[PDB]
C-alpha cells in the first residue's frame, strides 16, 4: 500500500520505541526498589529524566538536517541509544553509573527521535495523498512498540532482573540497527542534503563532543533536580521575556501553555498513576493476574486501536479543547473510582483504570499528535527551541505534581493511600476542567487569529 522504505522505517521505529518504553515503564519502580529512592525522589528524578528525553529532541532534527545527514544521524542515534541501554544494564554491577547511563539514553534519544519521521516524509512525492495514512501508521508503529514494551518489560524485570530487561532494550536497538543496515538499499536516494556529500569529520567530532558534554550535564541535572528546577525557571522566564519583546505567535504561545498542562498530565502515567495501579487497583482483569506496572500499556493499546478510527473521522483550537476535556475526564474518573467504587479493603476495579487510560489516550490523539504540525502552520527555530524547552519544563512540573501522591515505604493499608490518590487526581481533573473551559472560551478568538 506504501513505499518499500515505509516498512523499514515502521520496524526501526517499532524497535527503537520498544527499547525506550522498556526503560520508561520500569524506571520509577527501579528507583524505589533497586536504588532505594523514596517515591518522592523517584518521581522527581523520573521528571528530570523525562524532561531531558523530551527537551533534547530539538538537537536531532538540526543534526540530521544540517550536520551529518538524516540516515547517518539515525545510525548514530541508534548506536548511542543502545550504548545507553547496555550501560543501564551495567548499572546493576556499577550503581554509580546510573545517571550517566540515563543521560546517554536522553542524548541518544535526542539524536534519534526527529529523524525517522523526517526520512518517511521524503519517501513520498511532495503532495502524495498517502502521507496522512503513512504517518498514522508511523504513530501506530510507535505505540505497537510501546505496547509490547510496557506489557512485557515489567514481567521480564520481575522474572529475570533489571540487567536482563535493559540488555533487551539494547538488543531491540541493535535489531533496529540491523534492520536499517540490511535495508540501506531502499533509501539510497532518500535523505537530507548532508547524506549525499561525504561525512564532515569536523562536524561529526563537534556532535560527539557536544553529545558527551550533554551526557554529563544530563547525569548532573538528574542527580541534582533542585538546580535543574532553577535552570529551567530562569531559561523559561528569559525565553518568555525575549518572546514578548519580539499575532499568529500569540496563538502559538497560548497553545504552548495548554500543551504544558497536557504534558504535566502525560507525565503521571509512569509515576502517580503507576503507583495508584500498584497500591489501589486489583491486579486481575478477565480472570488473568498481571503485573500492575503493565497497566501503563493501556495508553498505547488505546492509541493503537483509536488512531485508525479517529483517522477515519472546529479544526485546531477545538481539537485541542476536546483533548483537554478528555484529559480532565480521565483524572476525574480516577478520582471518582477511588471515592465511590472501591472494595472495603480499599481496592478498585481495573476497568476504571482501563477507562482512565482510554480518556487520557484520546486526549493525546487530539493534542500532541496534532500539535507542532500546525504549530508549524502558525509560524521559527526559536519557537522549536521554546517548544521543547517548555515541554521539558512540563515534564519536571509533572514529576513534582506526582510527588503529591508519594506513599512512605512503611504504609501497607490501601485505605490510607486511596484518599491521597483521590484528592490529587480529583484536583488535577478539576484544574484541567477549568483550563479546558477557558480554552473553549478562547476557541473563537483563537480561530479568528489563525485567518
Amino acid at each position, epitope marked *: 500500500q506504501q513505499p518499500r522504505p515505509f516498512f523499514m522505517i515502521f520496524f526501526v521505529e517499532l524497535w527503537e520505541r520498544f527499547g525506550y518504553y522498556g526503560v520508561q515503564g520500569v524506571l520509577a519502580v527501579f528507583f524505589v526498589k533497586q536504588l532505594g529512592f523514596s517515591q518522592e525522589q523517584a518521581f522527581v528524578t523520573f521528571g528530570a529524566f523525562a524532561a531531558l528525553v523530551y527537551g533534547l529532541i530539538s538537537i536531532g532534527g538540526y543534526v540530521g538536517d544540517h550536520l551529518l545527514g538524516t540516515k547517518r544521524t539515525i545510525v548514530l542515534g541508534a548506536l548511542v541509544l543502545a550504548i545507553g541501554y547496555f550501560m543501564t544494564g551495567m548499572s546493576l554491577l556499577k550503581p554509580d553509573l546510573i545517571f550517566i547511563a540515563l543521560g546517554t539514553i536522553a542524548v541518544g534519544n535526542g539524536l534519534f527521535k526527529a529523524n525517522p519521521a523526517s526520512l518517511l516524509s521524503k519517501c513520498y512525492p511532495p503532495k502524495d495523498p498517502r502521507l496522512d495514512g503513512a504517518f498514522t501508521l508511523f504513530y501506530m508503529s510507535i505505540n505497537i512498540g510501546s505496547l509490547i514494551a510496557l506489557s512485557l518489560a515489567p514481567v521480564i524485570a520481575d522474572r529475570f532482573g533489571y540487567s536482563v530487561t535493559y540488555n533487551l532494550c539494547g538488543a531491540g536497538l541493535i535489531i533496529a540497527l540491523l534492520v536499517y543496515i540490511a535495508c540501506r538499499g531502499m533509501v539510497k536516494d532518500i535523505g537530507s542534503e548532508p547524506d549525499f556529500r561525504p561525512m564532515s569529520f569536523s562536524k561529526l567530532l563537534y556532535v560527539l563532543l557536544g553529545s558527551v558534554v550533554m551526557i554529563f550535564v544530563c547525569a548532573w541535572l538528574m542527580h541534582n533536580v533542585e538546580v535543574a528546577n532553577l535552570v529551567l525557571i530562569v531559561l523559561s522566564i528569559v525565553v518568555t521575556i525575549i518572546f514578548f519583546r519580539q499575532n499568529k505567535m500569540f496563538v502559538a504561545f497560548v497553545l504552548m501553555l495548554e500543551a504544558v498542562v497536557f504534558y504535566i498530565l502525560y507525565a503521571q502515567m509512569p509515576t502517580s498513576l503507576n503507583f495508584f495501579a500498584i497500591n489501589n487497583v486489583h491486579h486481575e482483569i478477565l480472570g488473568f493476574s498481571i503485573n500492575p506496572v503493565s497497566f501503563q500499556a493501556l495508553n498505547p493499546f488505546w492509541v493503537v486501536l483509536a488512531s485508525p478510527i479517529l483517522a477515519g473521522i472546529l479544526s485546531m483550537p477545538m481539537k485541542f479543547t476536546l483533548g483537554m476535556f478528555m484529559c480532565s475526564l480521565g483524572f476525574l474518573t480516577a478520582a471518582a473510582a477511588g471515592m465511590w467504587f472501591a*472494595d472495603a479493603q480499599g481496592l478498585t476495579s481495573p476497568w476504571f483504570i482501563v477507562l482512565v487510560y482510554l480518556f487520557q489516550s484520546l486526549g493525546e490523539l487530539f493534542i500532541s499528535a496534532l500539535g507542532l504540525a500546525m504549530i508549524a502552520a502558525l509560524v521559527m527555530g526559536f519557537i522549536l527551541g521554546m517548544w521543547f524547552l517548555t515541554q521539558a519544563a512540563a515534564f519536571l512540573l509533572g514529576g513534582y505534581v506526582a510527588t503529591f501522591t508519594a506513599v512512605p515505604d512503611n*504504609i*501497607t493499608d490501601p485505605l490510607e493511600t486511596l484518599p491521597v490518590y483521590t484528592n490529587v487526581f480529583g484536583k488535577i481533573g478539576l484544574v484541567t476542567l477549568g483550563v479546558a473551559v477557558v480554552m473553549l472560551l478562547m476557541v473563537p478568538w483563537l480561530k479568528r487569529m489563525i485567518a
Partner: nanobody
Amino acid sequence: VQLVESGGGLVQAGGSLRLSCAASGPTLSNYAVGWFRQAPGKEREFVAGINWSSGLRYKDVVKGRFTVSRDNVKDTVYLQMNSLKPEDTAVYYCAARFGGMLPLQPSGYANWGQGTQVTVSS
C-alpha cells in the same frame, strides 16, 4: 507465582513455630507477602504481612506474639509465631501481591501457597 510454604506442625500452648514462604520463578522481593489463616468453620482472615519495602501489617490479636520478616538474599518471608494459643489453630497460607500494599481480604492477592496446618494444643 507459586509460593511454597514450609514449617507447620503441632505445638503446645506458649510454644513457637516458624512458617516460611518461598517463590519459584518470580523474585519474591517485589511482593507484599501476607499470611492468612482459616480455622475450622470460619473464613480466611489476614494475619500478618510484609510489603515489598519492609513495611509491616498485623491483625490486632497477633500483635506482640507474631513477627513477619524477610530474608531478601534467600528470597523468603518468615512468620515467627511465639506465645502460641489454641485459638491460633488453623491452615496458614502465604499470599503475594505486587507492591507496597497489604490488603486485608484474600481477593487482594493473586498468588497463594497451598497451606500448612498449624495446631496448638492446650
